[model samples]
Target chain A: MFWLKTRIIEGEGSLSRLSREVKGHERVLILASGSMKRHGFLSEAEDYVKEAGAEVFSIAGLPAEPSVEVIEEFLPKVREFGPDLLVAMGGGSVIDTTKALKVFYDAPELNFGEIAFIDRFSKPKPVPRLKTLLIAIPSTSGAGSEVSGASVLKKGGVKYNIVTPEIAPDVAILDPRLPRTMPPEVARNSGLDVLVHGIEAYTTKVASPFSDAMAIKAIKTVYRWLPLSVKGDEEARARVHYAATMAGIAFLNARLGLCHAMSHKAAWIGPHGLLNAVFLPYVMEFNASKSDYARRRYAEIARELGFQTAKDLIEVVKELNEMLGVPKLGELVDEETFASKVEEMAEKTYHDGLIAFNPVEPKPEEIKELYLKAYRGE
Target chain B: MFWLKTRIIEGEGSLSRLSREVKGHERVLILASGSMKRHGFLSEAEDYVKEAGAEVFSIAGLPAEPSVEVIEEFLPKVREFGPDLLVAMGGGSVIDTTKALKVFYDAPELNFGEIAFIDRFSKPKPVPRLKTLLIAIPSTSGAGSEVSGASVLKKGGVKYNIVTPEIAPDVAILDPRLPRTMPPEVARNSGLDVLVHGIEAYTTKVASPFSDAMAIKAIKTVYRWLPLSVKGDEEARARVHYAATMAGIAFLNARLGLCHAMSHKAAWIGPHGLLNAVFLPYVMEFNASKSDYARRRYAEIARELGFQTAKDLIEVVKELNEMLGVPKLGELVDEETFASKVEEMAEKTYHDGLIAFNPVEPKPEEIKELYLKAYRGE
Candidate 1:
């Protein structure tokens, strides 16, 4: 299960690779923020495609966490336009949306839930070298959707982390100038996502030596640079930017743990990364209690980071969130609202594709309890 | 200078991948030990080739660090055979010989010195993707030649570190069963190469976040597993085996340091990795003294390894060599013999391509002094 083929295009003048990437394709389709004025990257991308000698059709103004219907509407244009190159030019959502469109574009008969279901059970069929090469240019430092095999989208009013190694991006372009546009909140929250990716991927069942190299580096980078990235230090933001992709590389091969499983379900209640920051400690606690691998790996991470044990690592993560002023899950949604949604979210969490990769697979009853405890935020 | 694409095929029953790699090739060349019984891997690899339905041209009994003449002699057969697939199944030296053979095989006009000089000065022109595919199946855990871009060989009575990115292996098969053939001495010396690769790559001028991820992990793995790997512990040897390639991935990009620069010249007096173990501490001292980046990176490595500073790291390496019973320069060569060769070796070390990548680029006079001091065994 451990494999990665994404050609990471970063470092100086890495943005020009968009031109290099789109080069040979006859037609290009760009998905980006609605207003080109709002995101300078949209126009910047269109220019690269134009320079590459390709005809361009673009879908713009994708919403945060694009829903199934929003994607369904774009399928007609995607099928009609028939782009040989698919480029995502905005944040994680824009990248994820492009991935979702490509999945449906390849297999027009498969719906969101069907693709997700097949991805887990029947085996997501590997699309032969596609005519349309998928390239993701992530504008946010979080999501790492640019390099990951998975894409996040909503179906039936719930988030689905659509994973199929087949849909994994062929190219990921990380431009440091892009993520500097984030406000402190997006910066802090998505930075949390980098941390979660490192931690979860490190301890997951599928974690290998390859993933450990990346995960440990990502975690160390976050501990050192994430705080400064929140304050908009360009150098620090640049470091965090690369760490996100490294984390993406980590999770891409090793997969992720329950922190992501629970957080993906709770994403509607709060930002994806904020939910991650909230649940990480509890997830660590639950996993460390039952999983020998989790405790040993966490302790290894702790010692490398200058701490004594896994408990110390957990405490350090909790401290990081408090320092960042990230609110608890209870603050986002009250007890009554959470109580109504808790059981459903837990059921969804138990079925989350990410759960199977977790170091310890929790039962639905325990997942329900985990949801309640994280909701209380004690 | 900072990229790799060698697909590592490891884990359970990975030898089957030899067939997977040779698929679609009409002609296969197997360069390995002379007697199939002496090295069981030679026949095992040929069997896979037969199963793949490709005709095989087996070149047996290539010596350790094949001399320029040895490689030159095979040039005719390699060109005549025109293998679409080149499979190397043996030790680091066999892999190196194959890499060297491919260099001449691709450019029949070029000889040893011309390739090395152009490699250092003029950018080694990337040979357009050749019709031939180079695959290395390493039997030893230490050389990491399976993934590294550089190759080692002898020419005109001196060692040459031949490097060209184009010759980097397309696939590296890392079956666990391969390295069990190592006697304790070969096991210990080559294990030191893993340590040197990690340390040098971590602090070299071209070191970046990407190489840092692999280098730090390799260093940590060596520290924890090298001793057990020397004791012939299968699990530790397995871990060390993976770390070798991880180190390979690291130095392939970040490049090596003065230790490799100096060690490559003195390789005749001792084993390649044994010379590396002897010279590492002195090289660390010289680099840390003059290079701020080296000091900082070394200190970070030290702290991560539960030490206080770069000084602690140098001390630890010295201690490791003593415990491993690796000899100093003087022990390998008598004082008068060393005196005769030290100046010449220092001169070669000064001109060595690996020196340019060192964190601290030393003067030839200083190189001479460094060699003498290391010879005293203090």
Candidate 2:
């Protein structure tokens, strides 16, 4: 019974909504990526917040991805500034870091180091609902962290997640002009992540009727426009941007299957979506082999999206990878490095809280084997 | 930047969430239908409220359709009782009445009779946001009033709408068990209404990326499951119930077009959905002729749902009407009675406010022509 609590703002001049949303928020904290500062959106956002008659303290240069170190570094600044509303106005990494920062700033006692690994076997505990509202404004299409409940954080070599519906953004503002600043590769990778999110949510055992509608539409939009978006079509890019947010909503409501479980533990081989791009087809094959339900659900997704069967979708994913273009996992990671990390990563994925939502329960050994197949592009 | 604020509860034992939602409220008012009382569901709901330690006072037997008389009759009772939460646990009529009661109970200054016809050339004014929250629990699956911002009320011969997003439910509980009590005909008519909502929302000029996803999926689900639902299949009925809520959300977000515009001013010829079931095909054909955009959108909806073209969808709608089976407009209303009211109804529909959302605006003469064609099953 999760609420789709976010208010979306899209179309031309949509950024104007930020000020109206800022009405109740007096001391506003705006977090952004380095690019946001360089591109000058940071100042523009600050100006908009000021229009609402609020004190806007701006911070930029968050990590390329959220990490324990980043959250710790930001905690002191956030405490000193003291904001009523925390605005994340950049890409997934920026939005996610803001989410992590919001959590730690609100509850200082939580051990940031052990956040994701606390129980290895049990689900992560949800942080209590806090008073400060968070608004996510995405400058690029990927990560869906703008609307998602879970914020992925990395430390050293592995990724961990903070999962709770209460932590999802209070509002998601999607203005097409913002993501137009994305480089083609960033657009391609993020767009592909949107596809992976759709596929995983639709096939997950935890899926609901609400998620199915969102997932199917997100998948259809990505399949039709991701290529065009990669080629720098703002029209198509805007559609993919909206699809990414929809997929985020689906992911929060339906949860994800093994692909997300495995990818969360995947080595930092490349950008998250590009890494997801490499691992997704392999996981689909594994889940399809494990459960007839998975096969049928994939087929349902395929047939609805104008494909004939499940394998048709599987084959198309391979073709889409080729069209959007990506390096195989084997090409990206060396044998020694891959072999050293394979076992623990496999075990972590096997016990990952998300594993409970997988279409089929895979053993640690089986997960390890699947990792090897993904590594070789088998 | 409208919000989809409602939390949903579905699957087995979803009714259990009602008490949890009733948590903060001390005074609860439950408005239900005669069926709810007869089936003993009202007592069950009252017990749930008491368990939450709230004051529970329920009133049953609201009109089959919301009427001005019902709101006037109940205004005094609601003023004296002063509920903190309003619960509508019936079909569209019950929900609409609850919404009307909420508005009048909150502000008694507005004249009830002038609600629909005022500012005929302008859009209806949204009522101010009120304090007490509304929760709708639909006992029948069609009107989607549980989640819609607009409530349709009738007085004399015309239907008036209270179009305000603030009036939409804070929570919509979609327990699988609640709508199980619907008779086969009720299920058919309601499921047909779900189809109308999807088609209207998908093609409406006011559609958004969010509404398109919901409207398309809702259309597909109704087409696939309505027949089985009418044959007393619980699983199919459950899917349609969920689809109705999705359609409701889409309709609220995207707004509906000519079909709804005409139907709101439609004569009291049949039940709301059944009336919608009859007007839909004519409106689709008229809009198709009026604009190429409408033709293409209908085709898009058709092809996505696995049909070939727009005309195929139009013909299919005819077959669906035959299968779900409704009498033609001519069979329902004789020529003299229809002729007497035709001109005013046509003019009223032209200015229905919803007409602004239509794919192509039509004059009163064209609307009258379409109505005549509809009466003859053309």
Candidate 3:
């Protein structure tokens, strides 16, 4: 049992080793995430995926929204390809797509309801013959999919996390080179995703010594590296890519808090990048209302990052957003949908996973109230 | 090949899960460092190991200098006990012992030479079946052995790194509770050991993105957490514990550099606490000379910990030593022997496995010169 199976490779010239390492694996798969759209004048959307020693197969198109239909349609073809290992590369969607496919590939009976109702129902059946080797390489660095055992995907009109140790990648590669060329706008959105991951993990109830270490380190690394990284500095890009992986690992291990619970519902369809613009502050306010420690901790993160007040976080995040082309919640998201769904989103979030672990557990009304306030930068 | 077998039971009451999760592992063979001799007053040396699970048979009362003879004599009993999982619960020495024993127990034909020379020559015949799992529950806040794959042990008057991916712990239980009461002294030496782990790994020729991600995080973690952790603060202890594990994982993947090269020699002997004491600063300086990047990194770490100049590192280390009751080199080691054998120590270090990856290669003479300078803190 003393097996250190995962091997991590880094450095500027390190990508050269990818070809050699991936060559021996019997089967190779790539989950591509860059825009099927256009990247200004560059067509390097597939750089990170190609580094995986396999060509990219679009698990889903590059878009903010990914649905179950995409996963269902893709898994069979992936299976037919008969890979010995499944390599997930790309953005959040691509990573999640592979996770969803792994679930069904291992256990054919796993479907929408079986997953959505996993907790109350009989323990979901274990994925069978899931001995397939899995490696996750994320181009967009937010979800620490590389080091985490959980992945989020939607099915049956509801989001679900098809989690099992078996689904975790045998190795997760971080190529800062891939994110170096991200369009400023794309970089902002991805960075926001990573920021939320770190914050939510820190505030989660299951937070432990192990998780907190990663969470805090990620926070510091992001705060140190993100601005420079998004500015197109190659060194900073490398730093942020690795930092994002660390943050993902931390949050994934600790579980998540309200922002994530709310994110599951709003991330795909929310207007103005709904939560990205308002996620941390709104969650902070809601949590502070219930727990002083969460508030102080937020303040500490701010101070560590050179902010004097928690309120400074808003300006800092917005400044970063402006720099990276991240649309504000009030700008990109449709207000009508957000207004109509606040209650629904809050209700769904409350009923979702165990929230008692949050530093401040908000009641359903409180969650909706928080969302209401966040509608225009609470 | 994708397997992450450790279960995390984190947060406020994670230690409670020790019993709940660790059951059925049967016999528990615990490894600890000589420093446990001091902490014997605060907590029972064997109690924590027993609490984690298993009928604890400890290799306690360790020598000031632990050599191959110690491991060879201890292996039979450890094998006789037949633990399903062997848990290393102290500093680097204890953890390394656990790694070496895994090979010895599995393949009867393998002796110390086979196990020790595994990396340079051939890995002891892979023992697919007769494997004893390693679970690291580090007593000190440094040395990140919990997540590493290499073990350092002395035999035939030389330090051997019995490295294999298989040596990575089955699980690393990062319990701040263990280090919560660490004497100021052990914390200092061990903490410095962890710092070097990151520095060396980052500077090593083989260092990769995987190792860099972890090393950088561990570096930042130590900069933020070490002071409070050694002071016996709870929250800080937790962060330091995580940092330690991160360092372990980093160096475990990529190799380490000159800091470890000399450390291997300095630590093999009985005088000077063998591993963590006098060598900490000396090795740091040796590596720092070849590592402009490493020195800059260390300076960064020093600055993060609130120091100003790279040269101030020695003083910073000295302060921790004073607080922790670390014996001075003059006090623990013989000056005459050190002076006469400094050449031998440098010779062995210059030729060892560590030298192969040193950022700046040292000829035997340069190595001797460095040792002489370090001897007087020059």
Candidate 4:
């Protein structure tokens, strides 16, 4: 009952095909991070794009977590650039920024205020169709923003997700060479993000057979290759990068559960991946406590990874987090500040759209208690 | 490294959404089978089409396996109809017929003669873009032709496959009500076709993680629901219908192996599903004999379905066939005629594009030997 519409291009040196992909467009805009240009990947892509004989403009130095003001500030610049094709050549921030830009670029009069973060059960109003073609090139292994239909943006000190089919990129290019250059920690944290996505999607209440198939495969790939990727194995990096997109496609349809709901509320305090890694196990335990189906689903994912049961699945994640050196929530955020804001974060998490898809719906009191447990890493 | 492009609409009463799907089109044409009209399914669909205020025309009574001449004769009629939206509501033959029609109606000057059945390792010339929007609604559970990028048409005593991205349907509707009317044997044979697609795609050399995820899911679904579907369970029928499309998407990207290669040649003699059911076990054994990876893949699929090993997978299929009353090739086709043409069939099969994707390449002699084994149900 769902639709799959992204055209993904993956492999080693996939960026070399940029010219062929953008052939029909007369004017192209390359949205990238400052780091990619310094690393020479951006320049390589620009060269291929120029060789395609299309007029190109560049916008670099986009932040890692594009805030609302950052997106608003770029709207006028993007409109002036007037690109027929928009190519995003960075990680989640750059790609998500471009997704928002695509929407505003098409409807110049539209405001971000017109959009609301709706729950999984709610229907969204139709947005304007994107006139420009979007091609996403991911340089990291996680944040499936490249292939997903939703965009996450931080606004007013809380993260909001804008879900619309119009925002999905027309093409995704997964170039293994990009991830090959990532620092060990960056690769580890990014791979962890994909793992959380898989676990949450697989155990979500709304998961269908289609989503289950994708989620389980993503989990298996991450478990097999994430450590090798962290050790700088390019082949392992390529498979993990591809699996991240698979996880993204899974979560996009299955929707996320309590982990994402809580992470969105706490991410402003620290790194989103660390937030997810810290909260995922607690959410899994909570879900299993409420629903036998959720526990059995976790057991199913565990079986795919050759584990004995749901408990083993949680233990494996804990081991992976330790290996990746993910810090506890208490270490990332000051304990005093976290304790003070725990109730507010819990309230926000309660209102989060993703909470609707959680296998076990939580009351604000239960969410606050969970946050407290996560803070202490108990 | 592959692309997915269909917007699948599934579940009970999915056909009710047809009008909303075709709201943008002014002139719509339906390509359907005679049974759909006799059973009043076509009329129900037309009611939905007219309710949306679109001008609609239907061409019904298409044959079970549409031949080359049948498609050619309908080209002018389809061109004269000049539909902006084409709806295909029947089994695989009707949907595949519509796919080819979509090509010819747009490019009347292009001759089928110019297109050859290129081997998988060879390159195919790019075909023209498809101008009309195609929507396929399958009444049967097998023949993922509804969602595939290629169409098979019988021409001059051989099945000629038209391979092009342009022929993939834009939308696929899987309605439970459609398969609810299928006879027991039709349900059994059609479900077997899906099982073959799943197994062949899973064992194919070109199979990617993306395709493997889908293929495994399809195999699991067919095993769980096909038996119930054959017994006329409406809910099982719905799930099996969805699995068929999943198998189609998997095989379309991953390609097929020896089972499909042999079935394509033997199918001209009798029912394609009967041919696949007879040959699948022999092909599985043949593949395992040459490639350790092929045997492991079969074992993996078997484990997913709760079997102990690859040999168990073959045995279960044998039992399923026995329960379904599928006859051996000797009983289905005239023994003397099959014997006379066995060598020729094997030779043609070796040249099939599908054989290029087989895990183990087979000589014509081996293929003839396999065919003889299948004829005797060895």
Name the top TM-score candidate: 2
Please give the DockQ score of every candidate, comma-separated: 0.33, 0.70, 0.28, 0.61
* Model 4 C-alpha RMSD to native: 3.3
Clashing pairs in 1: A33-A61, A34-A61, B34-B61
Ranking 1 against 4 by TM-score, winner: 4
Per-residue lDDT for B365 in model 3?
A: 91
lDDT of 3 at A115: 51
- A226: Cα error in model 2, Å: 1.2
* Ranking 1 against 2 by TM-score, winner: 2
Can you write out model 4's per-residue Cα lDDT over B285-338, one digit (the tens) per residue?
Answer: 988888899999989889888877889999988888887888877677787898
- Candidate order by lDDT, decreasing, is 4, 2, 1, 3
- Report lDDT (CA) for all predictions: 0.81, 0.83, 0.63, 0.84
Model 2, B136-219: lDDT tens per residue? 999887788887877777777446767677778888888867788899889888888899999999888878888888898899
Angstrom error of the Cα, residue A299, model 3: value is 2.7
Question: What are the clashing pairs of model 4?
Answer: none
Which one is best on lDDT? 4
lDDT string for model 1 (B151-196, tens) is: 7777776556676666788898887677767788878888899999
- Using all chains and alpha carbons, the TM-scores for the candidates as numbered come to 0.88, 0.93, 0.83, 0.90
Q: Which residue runs does candidate 2 get wrong by more than 4 Å?
A: A23-27, A51-55, A68-82, A104-129, A154-160, B24-27, B50-55, B72-83, B105-129, B154-159
Please give, for residues A201-282, the per-residue lDDT of candidate 3 as tens digits: 7777666545555566677777777777767888877877776776766666677677767766576565322354456667
